[PDB]
Design a protein around this ligand. Structure first.
Ligand SMILES: *[C@@H]1O[C@H](CO)[C@@H](O[C@@H]2O[C@H](CO)[C@@H](O[C@@H]3O[C@H](CO)[C@@H](O)[C@H](O)[C@@H]3O)[C@H](O)[C@H]2NC(C)=O)[C@H](O)[C@H]1NC(C)=O
Lengths: 22, 48
């Protein structure tokens, strides 16, 4: 976890960035 | 005269007498769900 933020790690942020009526 | 969402559905309009733009948002709806302890334990409920 990178606590400076949601306690996601740095590599979890890359993964969260790279992905992408009623 | 009309607006569209990506799924090819109406989502905005010209008012034909005062040409400002209105967003059409669908009326609020959804599932009604009853939270409950076991009816052996209590007769109380809460609703989502
Ligand atoms: C359809 O008909 C209606 C009614 O005749 C039109 O609405 C009116 O439009 C005029 C301008 O064409 C508005 O005049 C303005 O009034 C304000 C009042 O403070 C003034 O400050 C401005 O200098 C100007 O004189 C009038 O208010 C307006 N009335 C309403 C209730 O909106 C309408 O424009 C017509 N629409 C089409 C698409 O033809």
């Amino acid at each position: 976890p990178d606590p400076s933020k949601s306690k996601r790690s740095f590599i979890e942020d890359l993964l969260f960035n790279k992905v992408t009526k009623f | 005269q009309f607006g569209r969402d990506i799924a090819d559905t109406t989502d905005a309009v010209r008012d034909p007498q005062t040409l400002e733009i209105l967003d059409i948002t669908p009326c609020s709806f959804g599932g009604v769900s009853v939270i409950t302890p076991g009816t052996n334990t209590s007769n109380e409920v809460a609703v989502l």
